Amino acid sequence: KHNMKAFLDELKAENIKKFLYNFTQIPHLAGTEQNFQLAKQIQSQWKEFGLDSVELAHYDVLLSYPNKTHPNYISIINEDGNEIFNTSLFEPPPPGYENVSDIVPPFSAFSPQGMPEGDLVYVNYARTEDFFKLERDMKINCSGKIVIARYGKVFRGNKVKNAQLAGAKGVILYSDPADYFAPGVKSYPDGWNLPGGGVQRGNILNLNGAGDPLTPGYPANEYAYRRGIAEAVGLPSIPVHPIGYYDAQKLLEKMGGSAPPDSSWRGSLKVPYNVGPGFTGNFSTQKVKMHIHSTNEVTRIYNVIGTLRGAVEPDRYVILGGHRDSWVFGGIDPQSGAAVVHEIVRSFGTLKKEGWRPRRTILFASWDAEEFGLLGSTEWAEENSRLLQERGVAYINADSSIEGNYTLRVDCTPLMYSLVHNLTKELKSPDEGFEGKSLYESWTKKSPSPEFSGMPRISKLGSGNDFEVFFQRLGIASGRARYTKNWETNKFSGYPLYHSVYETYELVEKFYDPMFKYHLTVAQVRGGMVFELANSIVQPFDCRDYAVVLRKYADKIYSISMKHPQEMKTYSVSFDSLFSAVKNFTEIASKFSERLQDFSNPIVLRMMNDQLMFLERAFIDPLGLPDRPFYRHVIYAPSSHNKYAGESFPGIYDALFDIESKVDPSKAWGEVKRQIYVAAFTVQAAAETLSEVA
Amino acid sequence: KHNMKAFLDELKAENIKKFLYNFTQIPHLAGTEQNFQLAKQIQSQWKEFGLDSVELAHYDVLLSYPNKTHPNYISIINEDGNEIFNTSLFEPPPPGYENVSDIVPPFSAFSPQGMPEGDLVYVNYARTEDFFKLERDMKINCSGKIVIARYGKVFRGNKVKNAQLAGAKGVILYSDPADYFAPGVKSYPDGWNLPGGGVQRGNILNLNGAGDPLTPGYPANEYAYRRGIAEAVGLPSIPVHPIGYYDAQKLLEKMGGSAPPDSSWRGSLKVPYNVGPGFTGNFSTQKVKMHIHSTNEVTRIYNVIGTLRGAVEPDRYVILGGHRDSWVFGGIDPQSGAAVVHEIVRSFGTLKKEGWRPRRTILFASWDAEEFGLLGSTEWAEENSRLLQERGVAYINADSSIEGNYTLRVDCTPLMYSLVHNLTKELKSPDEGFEGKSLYESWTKKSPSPEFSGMPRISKLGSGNDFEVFFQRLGIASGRARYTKNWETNKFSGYPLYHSVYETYELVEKFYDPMFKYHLTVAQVRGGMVFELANSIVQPFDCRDYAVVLRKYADKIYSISMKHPQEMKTYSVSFDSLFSAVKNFTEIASKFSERLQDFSNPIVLRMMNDQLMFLERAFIDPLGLPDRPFYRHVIYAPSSHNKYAGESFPGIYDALFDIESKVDPSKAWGEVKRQIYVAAFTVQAAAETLSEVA
Ligand SMILES: *[C@@H]1O[C@H](CO)[C@@H](O[C@@H]2O[C@H](CO)[C@@H](O[C@@H]3O[C@H](CO)[C@@H](O)[C@H](O[C@H]4O[C@H](CO)[C@@H](O)[C@H](O)[C@@H]4O)[C@@H]3O)[C@H](O)[C@H]2NC(C)=O)[C@H](O)[C@H]1NC(C)=O
Ligand SMILES: *[C@@H]1O[C@H](CO)[C@@H](O[C@@H]2O[C@H](CO)[C@@H](O[C@@H]3O[C@H](CO)[C@@H](O)[C@H](O[C@H]4O[C@H](CO)[C@@H](O)[C@H](O)[C@@H]4O)[C@@H]3O)[C@H](O)[C@H]2NC(C)=O)[C@H](O)[C@H]1NC(C)=O
Ligand SMILES: COCCOCCOCCOCCOCc1cn(CCCC[C@H](NC(=O)N[C@@H](CCC(=O)O)C(=O)O)C(=O)O)nn1
Ligand SMILES: COCCOCCOCCOCCOCc1cn(CCCC[C@H](NC(=O)N[C@@H](CCC(=O)O)C(=O)O)C(=O)O)nn1
Ligand SMILES: *[C@@H]1O[C@H](CO)[C@@H](O[C@@H]2O[C@H](CO)[C@@H](O)[C@H](O)[C@H]2NC(C)=O)[C@H](O)[C@H]1NC(C)=O
Ligand SMILES: *[C@@H]1O[C@H](CO)[C@@H](O[C@@H]2O[C@H](CO)[C@@H](O)[C@H](O)[C@H]2NC(C)=O)[C@H](O)[C@H]1NC(C)=O
Ligand SMILES: *[C@@H]1O[C@H](CO)[C@@H](O[C@@H]2O[C@H](CO)[C@@H](O)[C@H](O)[C@H]2NC(C)=O)[C@H](O)[C@H]1NC(C)=O
Ligand SMILES: *[C@@H]1O[C@H](CO)[C@@H](O[C@@H]2O[C@H](CO)[C@@H](O)[C@H](O)[C@H]2NC(C)=O)[C@H](O)[C@H]1NC(C)=O
Ligand SMILES: *[C@@H]1O[C@H](CO)[C@@H](O[C@@H]2O[C@H](CO)[C@@H](O)[C@H](O)[C@H]2NC(C)=O)[C@H](O)[C@H]1NC(C)=O
Ligand SMILES: *[C@@H]1O[C@H](CO)[C@@H](O[C@@H]2O[C@H](CO)[C@@H](O)[C@H](O)[C@H]2NC(C)=O)[C@H](O)[C@H]1NC(C)=O
Ligand SMILES: *[C@@H]1O[C@H](CO)[C@@H](O)[C@H](O)[C@H]1NC(C)=O
Ligand SMILES: *[C@@H]1O[C@H](CO)[C@@H](O)[C@H](O)[C@H]1NC(C)=O
Ligand SMILES: *[C@@H]1O[C@H](CO)[C@@H](O)[C@H](O)[C@H]1NC(C)=O
Ligand SMILES: *[C@@H]1O[C@H](CO)[C@@H](O)[C@H](O)[C@H]1NC(C)=O
Ligand SMILES: *[C@@H]1O[C@H](CO)[C@@H](O)[C@H](O)[C@H]1NC(C)=O
Ligand SMILES: *[C@@H]1O[C@H](CO)[C@@H](O)[C@H](O)[C@H]1NC(C)=O
Ligand SMILES: [Ca+2]
Ligand SMILES: [Ca+2]
Ligand SMILES: [Cl-]
Ligand SMILES: [Cl-]
Ligand SMILES: [Zn+2]
Ligand SMILES: [Zn+2]
Ligand SMILES: [Zn+2]
Ligand SMILES: [Zn+2]
């Protein structure tokens, strides 16, 4: 029989291992020849594997690269202007890769050029609250200073935005061992920790969903009209560069000025973590000087798009997409994901060769330039937006399959919660001590839901990955899953070697997943979700789960507002309309569920499948959120303080945020009321899409 | 049998006559009790007629009314400040209506209050080119002057916008006999001409598709957050008031200053049509003073929404909508349309009572507040936008059924051209001399297509009626049809008694359509289109007709640009991408048509019906046109100089318009190139929705 079990059984750990090795021997940086060659290889293999069509879709987008003959670095300079200390020009390459060429040195992509010299101010994680504390409580002025911030906690683009707004003239990012060195584990190559010479690459844009900085709204095709650089979306105005903790220690150790305000400002280095500005007395005349010479350059990128045509509903698309470009070797990010996608394609193609097809069309994507701002997925979705909004059932992301070896992690729309619970109950746990138990059991035990007994935690989608255009711009139900660490015994950020040269095949094979069993489990979860979404007669979405979360989010945003009872009285700020809309959504969803269970009629079925498919779409507001026109989903947007985190009722959240500091409270509370109206209207409008159609 | 013929045969001229008489005995001004009573009557009757559900959908919107105890008027004042001439406080009511109360006096809805005094400047029709001629060629400065403009040629909202931008401090609108008095016909009540005391009411907003000025984007429901007046959309900044030609003659006859520049500036009154500023020597110290005291007031309005549920595709909507609010009695506008809708509902309900239902759902709408800015249709569409964009097949408008008695007039999307040609070939001509001939034959003979032999003229949709939100905001295929005059023997504007108290049942019954046969023909055309759209197995849209017009519009916009060959060379302005996209659309449409003809499979059918339905939707750009976010259709928008007229490739048209006057030609030609890209991309994207889906 051709059923889910046949699909799942065909997936092999050893194939995923072979593919990951194949994908990680040389760098595959976006816009380089090596990554175009890998695109062509994947295209050829997906055709071999049996897909109906496999094409490259290319775009010409703004990318950023260091200047090979004028390297980026930072100095401490003395009074005479002699550079008495320089940061590294490259990470020491790992064993056996010391002769690999075309390793891009650490840099912050899209930094402008400049050579600013000045006094340092240390800004902790450069979060909104870190700058509040500096400016409001400590009265430290960052204007015209170079800021040094530790990585961690929030997206580094938000750090740079916050430093720019505080008036900084440059930003130095570094990895503190507090956040990237787990106690008791060895540095690479002897363990999975970040060595003192390791450095995290990464872009520092604030695109807010725009895609290619030069062509917001429209694909960067052959005839596209491009903005000039000065009108580009999301570029930073001040130079930025990342360093490791050996170099950081040399910059921090001389810091004077004010003491750190409390222990949450101290990392693990043997330095006082003084805030500055500038150095202690003996060194007060020394300064820090950046030298940044990277260039922004329009460059061709290539997505691979494979199609497995549906037997019954070929005009309904279930998309499995993940990126292929990497900063260096991409051992975890993204090739641990891409190898899993490759094996999923192979398994679906095996069934296809025996005469099976899924009910709906499945699209498979190998995106380019994710690392430079989700560029490949976003341009392709801009090109195909009309097809996607009228035919897109679901998008399942497939970046890094692992960031630890402890338990499952899933972030998804509420519409997929029931699907995920049901699928994981049918999958075997790969965990030690859970032999013969379901993945649901191990996952629920290790990661309990904060709200419900006997259920696992599933998070909201944030951003910083390729589902962003599909979910928050276009309103297509989206999900992602991977194996993760235990956050409770682990205070560190993501995984330590993230975006470093040390992220290699050997890192994964030796330290993360020697038997490829966590990868296989992740292929079963992503692959199984795609299988159900593409083959279930009725869409496997439960609108009732959206009703439950909408109530939770309404309670949450009301509770934020209720910190200001005087203002709510003065300005007549009521959440009544929002709770009313949520109550209505609950009632209508419950009645729709009864009809869905209670209807041989393919029109009523497809009418009902269309109501399920367009339910996520109903949360889109075509006017977007304030000053972020590509974040159109009214329930979820990436946090305005941290692109990685999701925020619920973001329009009301941002209206309330720091409202006690607004100079015109009438206007500010007016805008809170406006956002309440927009949210209540959108919830009620979404509910009404589930009412009887006539 | 229950087929189109049964539907059509049930329509009766005498019923339309009875309904028009019923609808026109008292005024039905938006927001008044009388129009709420009529809404309730129509709701009750539509239920009686057999519709499945008939509801009122109400909204609270900004309306405008004169102050009953402080009337609007205009004066000529002397040096001492004595008002030596005053314009009328009301139109002399017609015979037998001299005791009807609640006739709103002539006013310009949404005018601000004020009593500006100043010198007059006469500005012809107050068109963009009239102001170019005054300022650029004649060097006449309108700043701080009161402008007097004749009605006609363009929407009066555009006249007011143009006068405001020229620096006018008030605007007087009047009806010149050149434009509202057909030679050889008598004034009302003895003929259908405008008497010297007659005055055209009408709003002077520039909403650009926004709907209620206070709630752009969102329905004006019970909890809506409203803009303050100073942030409202589209309100005029200077007072405006309309007068008849007896009063106009008194204002114009003393005009001095410059002579009219040529005969196209002279109307038919016995005055020189001097441009001014101010009066001839003896009267040079006299001034004109306006007194405007109207108020803007949020007021409840009521749409009636009737539903005839589809038997097979109840989640596909064909909408027949027209408004019910009138300035006074609404003899032509809108009740000649509303009586036709009423009889269509009655006929469909007759078939329903015998057990028939249409394949798709038909929605019937009696909109309110059309006269105040398309408010009722637009708020309802804002409320229901998610249902409409995913389920809306077509919208057929139903305002005035007649504006003459000569031949048919149709304006519609190219997708309905074939449907209209085929339907009119099956209908009887009502014209004298065409007894026994089809409506197609009479219409084609009287109104030949400018492009094609043996076909009738069908125009683009402009705006200034209730299809605007459905077509240019939401991208739902739309059409309208009515009987019209012979434009060739008739230099006058619309019909003479438009928006005057003289537009009565008697005007229609005595002078326009005594036998109600043109009304019946119009009911057959609107009703027949709805019947086909709602019952044809395959949608009756032909995508090939869009390909033909897109080529015509591309040739047209290229020819405009080619007036500037030097600039096109300097700035490398190419239309190649647009012609390429149009060529591709042509090829893909031709192949889709073959598949449509060449496919027992209801999924392939509905998949194909969905491609037909979403084809108009594909021309929507969610970012809208520049500074007009509610005009989202890239092929058609209302002209930025005349809301009544449609413009094709409006984004490129407005980029090119008066470009030789722009101070930075590099920037201006850059924006032309940007609009070419947007248009070529949208055409290609629309074409791709017709490609095989996988
Ligand atoms: C959740 O669903 C419920 C329906 O189950 C829906 O209830 C609707 O609520 C509105 C209130 O927002 C009701 O509106 C009323 O309608 C009547 C006519 O039907 C009007 O007369 C009322 O207006 C008068 O009273 C107002 C309130 O004091 C005054 O402000 C006003 O000036 C008038 O005096 C009022 O407009 C509507 O009837 C119900 N609909 C029902 C019960 O079917 C509710 O709105 C939904 N929630 C959301 C957020 O949409
Ligand atoms: C109408 O439909 C046709 C298809 O029937 C479609 O043709 C496409 O045109 C584009 C050009 O805009 C072609 O793009 C080329 O693709 C190849 C790889 O396939 C690239 O190598 C080419 O780039 C090189 O050459 C350029 C031009 O000189 C240089 O600028 C560039 O730097 C590279 O050197 C180029 O990108 C595309 O292949 C075809 N697709 C086909 C034939 O299937 C056409 O675009 C459609 N019209 C519109 C308006 O969409
Ligand atoms: C409710 O009250 C809130 C209280 O606050 C506490 C909890 O909220 C915070 C939620 O944290 C979300 C996590 O933020 C921290 C973080 C995460 N990370 C891991 C980064 C892994 C990102 C990787 N994506 C990625 O590398 N993409 C590129 C490009 C992304 C882009 O350009 O958008 C990049 O990030 O550089 C991925 O998705 O796997 N690092 N720091
Ligand atoms: C290609 O080169 C162009 C050369 O230019 C020549 C041809 O282009 C011009 C096309 O003319 C379009 C007609 O404009 C002139 C006109 C039309 N009218 C008739 C008005 C009838 C409007 C009525 N609608 C209406 O009354 N709606 C209200 C409210 C509309 C609103 O608020 O949007 C109103 O107009 O006050 C209807 O649709 O029946 N008066 N003047
Ligand atoms: C990754 O695997 C691919 C597929 O096997 C390898 O590419 C093939 O290489 C062989 C031997 O050079 C060629 O004859 C084939 O034409 C290639 N097939 C393709 C490109 O589809 C590639 O060598 C492997 N890379 C590494 C680093 O092991
Ligand atoms: C840090 O690097 C800089 C730049 O390479 C070094 O300064 C240069 O030294 C060379 C050779 O002695 C001089 O000719 C250049 O004029 C210097 N350039 C600048 C910009 O000052 C510096 O010596 C290095 N410092 C350390 C401690 O290694
Ligand atoms: C997850 O599985 C549950 C349990 O099988 C499904 O809920 C059942 O669905 C069937 C089929 O409609 C109903 O007859 C049962 O009453 C349901 N049991 C319940 C609600 O406890 C549920 O549909 C599945 N979720 C999916 C497929 O998304
Ligand atoms: C327009 O027609 C309607 C429908 O016949 C008339 O309203 C009816 O009036 C009768 C007699 O007063 C009442 O008993 C009914 O209840 C009404 N039916 C409704 C409102 O649905 C109305 O009188 C007519 N108006 C004019 C001016 O002739
Ligand atoms: C035009 O109307 C105005 C306003 O009614 C007339 O002027 C008023 O005349 C009355 C009675 O004689 C005075 O008490 C008011 O003071 C005047 N008002 C103003 C604003 O001037 C005027 O007489 C009328 N002119 C004509 C020719 O009928
Ligand atoms: C208008 O009528 C024409 C003529 O009947 C229709 O065109 C025919 O459609 C049939 C059915 O598919 C084809 O087999 C014929 O070849 C067509 N004749 C032609 C193109 O000359 C046309 O479809 C109708 N338009 C509608 C329904 O929108
Ligand atoms: C990089 O630096 C070199 C060497 O100083 C310079 O000549 C060249 O212009 C730069 N390259 C780019 C792409 O800016
Ligand atoms: C911070 O520094 C600059 C002076 O160089 C000044 O313009 C700015 O206003 C200062 N802000 C403060 C002290 O709050
Ligand atoms: C793998 O799991 C073991 C057992 O808990 C743990 O000690 C080790 O730290 C894990 N490896 C990684 C990379 O997390
Ligand atoms: C209308 O004018 C009267 C009489 O002068 C005035 O008292 C009243 O305030 C005005 N009404 C409105 C609605 O402004
Ligand atoms: C028109 O009139 C005013 C003077 O009252 C002036 O400010 C404006 O610039 C003038 N424009 C001209 C003469 O072009
Ligand atoms: C009705 O038609 C006749 C015949 O052409 C014409 O003379 C008359 O002007 C028409 N009436 C109207 C209102 O157009
Ligand atoms: Ca783009
Ligand atoms: Ca509104
Ligand atoms: Cl992922
Ligand atoms: Cl109409
Ligand atoms: Zn990644
Ligand atoms: Zn990454
Ligand atoms: Zn009308
Ligand atoms: Zn009108």
Swiss-Prot record, chains A, B:
<keyword id="KW-0106">Calcium</keyword>
<dbReference type="GO" id="GO:0009986">
    <property type="term" value="C:cell surface"/>
</dbReference>
<feature type="active site" description="Nucleophile; for NAALADase activity">
    <location>
        <position position="370"/>
    </location>
</feature>
<comment type="function">
    <text>Has both folate hydrolase and N-acetylated-alpha-linked-acidic dipeptidase (NAALADase) activity. Has a preference for tri-alpha-glutamate peptides. In the intestine, required for the uptake of folate. In the brain, modulates excitatory neurotransmission through the hydrolysis of the neuropeptide, N-aceylaspartylglutamate (NAAG), thereby releasing glutamate. Involved in prostate tumor progression.</text>
</comment>
<dbReference type="GO" id="GO:0004181">
    <property type="term" value="F:metallocarboxypeptidase activity"/>
</dbReference>
<feature type="active site" description="Charge relay system">
    <location>
        <position position="610"/>
    </location>
</feature>
<feature type="glycosylation site" description="N-linked (GlcNAc...) asparagine">
    <location>
        <position position="22"/>
    </location>
</feature>
<dbReference type="GO" id="GO:0005886">
    <property type="term" value="C:plasma membrane"/>
</dbReference>
<dbReference type="Pfam" id="PF04389">
    <property type="entry name" value="Peptidase_M28"/>
</dbReference>
<feature type="glycosylation site" description="N-linked (GlcNAc...) asparagine">
    <location>
        <position position="282"/>
    </location>
</feature>
<feature type="binding site">
    <location>
        <position position="203"/>
    </location>
    <ligand>
        <name>substrate</name>
    </ligand>
</feature>
<dbReference type="GO" id="GO:0016020">
    <property type="term" value="C:membrane"/>
</dbReference>
<keyword id="KW-0325">Glycoprotein</keyword>
<feature type="glycosylation site" description="N-linked (GlcNAc...) asparagine">
    <location>
        <position position="99"/>
    </location>
</feature>
<feature type="binding site">
    <location>
        <position position="323"/>
    </location>
    <ligand>
        <name>Zn(2+) 1</name>
    </ligand>
</feature>
<feature type="binding site">
    <location>
        <position position="465"/>
    </location>
    <ligand>
        <name>substrate</name>
    </ligand>
</feature>
<keyword id="KW-0735">Signal-anchor</keyword>
<dbReference type="GO" id="GO:1904493">
    <property type="term" value="F:tetrahydrofolyl-poly(glutamate) polymer binding"/>
</dbReference>
<dbReference type="InterPro" id="IPR007365">
    <property type="entry name" value="TFR-like_dimer_dom"/>
</dbReference>
<feature type="glycosylation site" description="N-linked (GlcNAc...) asparagine">
    <location>
        <position position="422"/>
    </location>
</feature>
<dbReference type="InterPro" id="IPR003137">
    <property type="entry name" value="PA_domain"/>
</dbReference>
<feature type="binding site">
    <location>
        <begin position="643"/>
        <end position="644"/>
    </location>
    <ligand>
        <name>substrate</name>
    </ligand>
</feature>
<comment type="subunit">
    <text>Homodimer.</text>
</comment>
<feature type="binding site">
    <location>
        <position position="382"/>
    </location>
    <ligand>
        <name>Ca(2+)</name>
    </ligand>
</feature>
<keyword id="KW-0121">Carboxypeptidase</keyword>
<dbReference type="InterPro" id="IPR007484">
    <property type="entry name" value="Peptidase_M28"/>
</dbReference>
<keyword id="KW-1003">Cell membrane</keyword>
<keyword id="KW-0597">Phosphoprotein</keyword>
<feature type="binding site">
    <location>
        <position position="370"/>
    </location>
    <ligand>
        <name>substrate</name>
    </ligand>
</feature>
<comment type="function">
    <text>Also exhibits a dipeptidyl-peptidase IV type activity. In vitro, cleaves Gly-Pro-AMC.</text>
</comment>
<dbReference type="Pfam" id="PF02225">
    <property type="entry name" value="PA"/>
</dbReference>
<feature type="binding site">
    <location>
        <position position="218"/>
    </location>
    <ligand>
        <name>Ca(2+)</name>
    </ligand>
</feature>
<dbReference type="GO" id="GO:0008233">
    <property type="term" value="F:peptidase activity"/>
</dbReference>
<feature type="glycosylation site" description="N-linked (GlcNAc...) asparagine">
    <location>
        <position position="141"/>
    </location>
</feature>
<feature type="binding site">
    <location>
        <begin position="498"/>
        <end position="499"/>
    </location>
    <ligand>
        <name>substrate</name>
    </ligand>
</feature>
<feature type="binding site">
    <location>
        <begin position="480"/>
        <end position="482"/>
    </location>
    <ligand>
        <name>substrate</name>
    </ligand>
</feature>
<feature type="active site" description="Charge relay system">
    <location>
        <position position="574"/>
    </location>
</feature>
<keyword id="KW-0963">Cytoplasm</keyword>
<feature type="binding site">
    <location>
        <position position="156"/>
    </location>
    <ligand>
        <name>substrate</name>
    </ligand>
</feature>
<keyword id="KW-0472">Membrane</keyword>
<keyword id="KW-0511">Multifunctional enzyme</keyword>
<dbReference type="GO" id="GO:0046872">
    <property type="term" value="F:metal ion binding"/>
</dbReference>
